[PDB]
Amino acid sequence: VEGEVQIMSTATQTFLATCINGVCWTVYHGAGTRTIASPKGPVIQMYTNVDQDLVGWPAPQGSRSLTPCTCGSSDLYLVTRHADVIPVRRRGDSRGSLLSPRPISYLKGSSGGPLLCPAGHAVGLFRAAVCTRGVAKAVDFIPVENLETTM
């Protein structure tokens, strides 16, 4: 059994990564230029794109790749590090609003997780929570085309 999404840890921080097209992606503001652990020792990033807050490693063992959305919908679903699935309406290239706003702590440690279309394909990686007095009402995300172009 393989997973598309890996729960990840650094000393100071905790976040998610999403495998797509054979690459394991997450947010720069989590991993920096750090390497990924493997049973043969550290593996270096293949991609680092600070402009876009995006880094990629080679897909780890025990992982499955997500297919990118060709599907177009604006109905997205954000998956958290607890495997909650949060409905999000897409507004712009890289913006979407929660259908039911949540305390920001509910999104904590979930950046790098996937926004999925209705077919369960990849629309983008969850980048950042837009908060108002502690309530997350929308999210920034890295569109999946940014990944494709980076490649």
């Binding site: 059994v1 393989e2 997973g3 598309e4 999404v5 890996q6 729960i7 990840m8 840890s9 650094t10 000393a11 997450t26 991993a31 750090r34 390497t35 990924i36 652990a37 550290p42 780890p60 025990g62 992982s63 499955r64 997500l66 998956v79 590090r81 495997a83 999925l116 369960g120």
Partner: peptide, 16 residues
């Protein structure tokens, strides 16, 4: 330091 993997999520819910 290196980034380590501490768990995994399977989207379909597929059991081992």
């Amino acid at each position: 330091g290196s980034v380590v993997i501490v768990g995994r999520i399977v989207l379909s819910g597929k059991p081992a």
